[PDB]
């Protein structure tokens, strides 16, 4: 069995990674690293709370850490964690810094320990129809893929640091490395402070890759718009693991990650027909992450694809900021090696 | 020839000049097509029998009977024939493209002016029934401040002047029309279809200090896309299908007859409680831009449609092609004095 100290029970580690981690057969959250002993208890009884996350990282019986911890601590805990002999799981943001991703990535290798980054939505309902969509053939090559991640919240990091690394991550996936970013950020809510509206498109050789979210969408948008030169299909409805989460659905109950709005596919005729979309299920990145511990498959999510995503998004940012056109700032061995690993 | 009514030469009456400037004429009162200027008496005598054609364009420019200019030939004859028609003493509309630069468009401004004859280019788009509908609901206030508008023209046509210099053109002029002039312009344009030797995916951002507009441009969507799609604080709305005016003219449909404009899709408005209720279309009519040039040449109003403002299309135009060459983000090449006269104009 693997031995879990989840660092953190603010909202992420109560709300996300506990209720996936305890999901998961082959796994066992043993320790949680937390100031209040209390709130963690009323809800994992048979957990041992400790109040320090250095001692936690650090502990015998821990085999892999999940650091769920505030952002600045991220990257702190995890080099104690490596250094501990421990295999770590870093919840968004991997490091606040690329500069310390790379030395995280190589102090991992060093220490020949796992080290990944919480991308969760590899397996989300409406990707994984989308992506079979893509795969069927039925579109033809895709040309223009169009992806939204936008609700209404008129009431008053930022909505780009914070859905930005889902679009991107499922975008990389499915496209590998773009040769450019361009990016517009903007905070358009009457008295917001931080952006709220966030336009990035991916430029590949032959398609474009637009990555969308907004606070003020009260409807009208699609989850999902791909075209190709056979035909298009759209996806209008969002996942819904994260709401079945926040409303304290158990993963991997009856209804977990079912998506009944089904993929709607427009062939060279104009007309529309539907199909089904798969189920979604985000334990899949632990059941996966297990499976790497136990040398059954390589790590599901290498770290060098977590700096991959936050090259685009600090590229994106670039953009935003000096109104130019950008492109990543990756080595050509990380380069060469997302390629590789891009199958 | 009439004396109460407003003479008009057509010039060339190739598709344009006979699938639209012709009919939408013919069926406004005031205005009398008396001219035409065509190579081939036979095609245009074929739909209109009565009709004085002149070979040269030319001579049909400037003949004394002729009081309007309706320019539809070639666009490169854009330029030289409202240049000679204007110095001619009439009154020139000129079918897109105004000219072929800025230089001589503020040219053609300044020699209407100076000439004082009235000047004007045929953005026609200004009374779609998807427009006059999006900006029905924007100027209710049922969507409270406008962040996000998007426009898009987009048909499938995997099967191979550009499309974006086609059809970006009315896009603008209808987010100027409603907006003013953005702050900068951002531009993505790329040719996608295997085979296609021009862009037909056209991505542009028009910058304004509290909102953003993107105008959407592409041959090779099957499906999913709305006309436009807006959003404000207080709610949404989205306009599936396209005017029908176009379809109506390439059909014969005749111009103010029965059915002209008329469109039975629903505005869909999203309130905050994220709930859809349809709204009726308003009926388009293009007609409006000849009944609005014969007003204003008749005095009673100002050019529905005066020059600058289709420079300020040019401009935009101009800087998303720019901007989508260089990756940098672009401002408008207008003068200031072109700037006052559109911030007042845009009030
Ligand atoms: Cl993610
Ligand atoms: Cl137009």
Redesign the interface.
Known sequence: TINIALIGYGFVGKTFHAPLIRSVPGLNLAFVASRDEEKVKRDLPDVTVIASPEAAVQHPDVDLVVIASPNATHAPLARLALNAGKHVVVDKPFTLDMQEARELIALAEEKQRLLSVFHNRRWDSDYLGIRQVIEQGT???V??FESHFDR?R?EVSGLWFDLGPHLIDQALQLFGLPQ?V?G?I?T???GAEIND?A?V?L?YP???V?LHC?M???????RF?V????????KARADQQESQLLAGVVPGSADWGQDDDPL?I???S?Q?HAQATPQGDQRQYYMLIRDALKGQIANPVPPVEALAVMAVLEAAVRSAES???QTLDLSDDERNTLREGHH
């Open positions: 579109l033809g090559a040309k223009h209404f008129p450019s361009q517009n903007a358009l809510r009457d509206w336009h498109v430029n032959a398609h474009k637009i907004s003020l969408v009260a409807g009208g948008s699609s718009t075209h190709g030169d056979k035909g298009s299909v759209i709607v427009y062939d060279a104009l529309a109104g130019m056109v």
